Amino acid sequence: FDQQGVFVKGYAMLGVTDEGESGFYRTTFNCNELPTDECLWAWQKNQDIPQLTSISWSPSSQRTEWVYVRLGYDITQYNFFLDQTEGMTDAETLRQRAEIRFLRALHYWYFLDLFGKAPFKEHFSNDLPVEKKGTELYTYIQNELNEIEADMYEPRQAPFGRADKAANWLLRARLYLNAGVYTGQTDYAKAEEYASKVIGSAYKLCTNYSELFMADNDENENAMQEIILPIRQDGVKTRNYGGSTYLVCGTRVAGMPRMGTTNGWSCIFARAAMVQKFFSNLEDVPMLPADVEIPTKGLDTDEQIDAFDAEHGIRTEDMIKAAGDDRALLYSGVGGGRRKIQTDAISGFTDGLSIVKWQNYRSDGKPVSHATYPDTDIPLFRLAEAYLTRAEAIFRQGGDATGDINELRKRANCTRKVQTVTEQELIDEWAREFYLEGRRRSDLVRFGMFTTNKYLWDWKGGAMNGTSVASYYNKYPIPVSDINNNRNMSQNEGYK
């Protein structure tokens, strides 16, 4: 038993691994992004993509089984480390157990949030996991975090990459924020409290939003000060087709300026509703006029591409100025072809605006380690979450959440201030702040907008302009394979 090595692998499971399809981050990300208003997967021919895209999957869903099997696998590995260090009481080992138990709690949260239940197992053995659902599961996760807190590093006192007390508190805030959904009983007071504990910690907001998703976010202090839990990635050493490689390569295509990589998969683009988050009137979106032809030559270098885009006011920096928000990191320029905002039929990558939020360029201008894979870390946990969580919690309780909302909009140099917080403004702010970070679905569900008519976005439910689906889709089904293999599990309501 190599305690040190197993400990390290526990964290590694977040960012390393069809293999490229079944990783931790990619599977959770897809279940929380592909069916939402933020994006679309360009190749609908890919297995189960249509299902996830329009919220029409079933118990035989391959992508549901992927995330399900992956989450459980990671936990079995955490259970192994825990059984091997059980009873030990030295300071460092306790700290290691707390961090591993934090990672397991995080995994159980995914189960709870995605399936509303989980195949529960506390130790590493061969027995069949037993089902732990709803309130029972919720309380288990909360208890774990409450117990391990004292054994963890103080905020920002842990080696970059490892989880500290704040990471602990932020997850608890998120759980409390969703208590109504998971236990049927809201607990917004607690959500506010723990959110305040994180805001009261050493962590601080990065003064430049984009820098949070750049190649040097693990060395740039301005970004690190806000990154509570990073999933380390590295162009040469830590590679994963489903890691940051997914977020950068998947969102680019040959022809785009400053791709940051040699391989543009042209897979992920934004839905019209995502663009609308920055432009209430989609007519305000900078776009190349229909009657202006795109040259077939002379648009090779970034300087040539930028020159054309600038002439027509369609460089990403032009998109940002038009949106009056630093977060509007979208591309409607010509590199890659004439783009559409909304499409009458999902036919390709250009049927929507490109998202260039993630970049494989360092804020300090220095070279990155590789030409194809990004160095960019995935800031899974960010301080900003605390502000949005406290803002929502305060709002729900009848208080005034304008101060917390403004803190984020001020950071993004927004020209439009939110005077009166409303449910609509809140869910739209979650989108603007965290889009393409793998959490959208969870928030939509909390707001009662994921499956209902309360909120319709393009291509929801499979309809061009969107439509509602059965309410039982607010939870993914337990893979039919686990049902037949583990008599202890029972399918979720609504499915067959």
Answer yes or no: are the C-beta atoms of 452 and 472 closer than 8 Å: no
Closer to Ca ion by Cβ: residue 375 or 428: 375
Assign 405 to helix, strand or coil.
helix
- Helices 165-177 and 134-148: crossing angle, nearest 10°? 160
In the block, tokens 């992508």 appear at 63
Which among 19-27, 369-377, 431-439, 470-478 is the span making contact with Ca ion, rule CB under 5 A? 369-377
In the block, tokens 């732990």 appear at 132
Which among 75-83, 213-221, 322-330, 356-364 is the span making contact with Ca ion, rule CB under 5 A? 213-221
The CB-of-299 to Ca ion minimum distance in angstroms stands at 32
Closer to Ca ion by Cβ: residue 234 or 428: 234
Contacting residues for 73 by C-beta, under 8 A, at least 6 apart? none
Which among 226-234, 363-371, 431-439, 466-474 is the span making contact with Ca ion, rule CB under 5 A? 226-234
Give the residue, chosen from 74, 218, 325, 429, that forms a contact with Ca ion under the rule CB under 5 A.
218
The CB-of-214 to Ca ion minimum distance in angstroms stands at 10
- Tell me: does residue 48 bind Ca ion (CB under 5 A): no
Q: How far apart are CA 484 and CA 99, in angstroms?
A: 34
Ramachandran quadrant class, 163 (left: phi over 0; alpha: psi -120 to 50; beta: rest) = beta
Closer to Ca ion by Cβ: residue 188 or 358: 358
The CB-of-361 to Ca ion minimum distance in angstroms stands at 13
Q: How far apart are CA 142 and CA 221, in angstroms?
A: 31
Closer to Ca ion by Cβ: residue 247 or 426: 247
The CB-of-23 to Ca ion minimum distance in angstroms stands at 16
Closer to Ca ion by Cβ: residue 211 or 234: 234
Closer to Ca ion by Cβ: residue 375 or 404: 375
Closer to Ca ion by Cβ: residue 81 or 213: 213
In single-letter form, the type of residue at position 99 comes to E
Q: How far apart are CA 248 and CA 436, in angstroms?
A: 11
Answer yes or no: are the C-beta atoms of 276 and 249 closer than 8 Å: no
Which among 126-134, 377-385, 400-408, 485-493 is the span making contact with Ca ion, rule CB under 5 A? 377-385
Closer to Ca ion by Cβ: residue 158 or 483: 158
Concatenate the DSSP letters of all residues of 428-496 into one string: HHHHHHHTTSS-HHHHHHHTT-SSSTTS--TTGGG-TT-----GGGGSPPPPHHHHHH-TT--PPTT--
The CB-of-92 to Ca ion minimum distance in angstroms stands at 25
The CB-of-238 to Ca ion minimum distance in angstroms stands at 7
The CB-of-4 to Ca ion minimum distance in angstroms stands at 21
Residue 381 bridge partners (DSSP):
229
Closer to Ca ion by Cβ: residue 231 or 299: 231
Which among 109-117, 269-277, 329-337, 374-382 is the span making contact with Ca ion, rule CB under 5 A? 374-382
Closest CA to 409 of 290, 323, 332, 305: 323
Query: What sign has the CA pseudo-torsion 487, 489, 490, 496?
Result: negative
Count of CB atoms within 10 A of residue 42's CB? 22
Task: Give the contact letters, 61-80, x = binds to Ca ion (CB under 5 A), - = no.
Answer: --------------------
The CB-of-453 to Ca ion minimum distance in angstroms stands at 42
**Element spanning 195, H or E:** helix 188-199
Give the residue, chosen from 99, 187, 377, 392, that forms a contact with Ca ion under the rule CB under 5 A.
377
Give the residue, chosen from 38, 144, 164, 375, that forms a contact with Ca ion under the rule CB under 5 A.
375
The CB-of-154 to Ca ion minimum distance in angstroms stands at 24
User: Torsion over CA of 362, 367, 372 and 377, rounded to 10 degrees?
Assistant: -30
Backbone angles phi, psi at 58, to 5 degrees: -140, 180
Which among 42-50, 230-238, 348-356, 410-418 is the span making contact with Ca ion, rule CB under 5 A? 230-238
Query: Which stretches of the chain bind Ca ion, using CB under 5 A?
Result: 218, 233-234, 375, 377
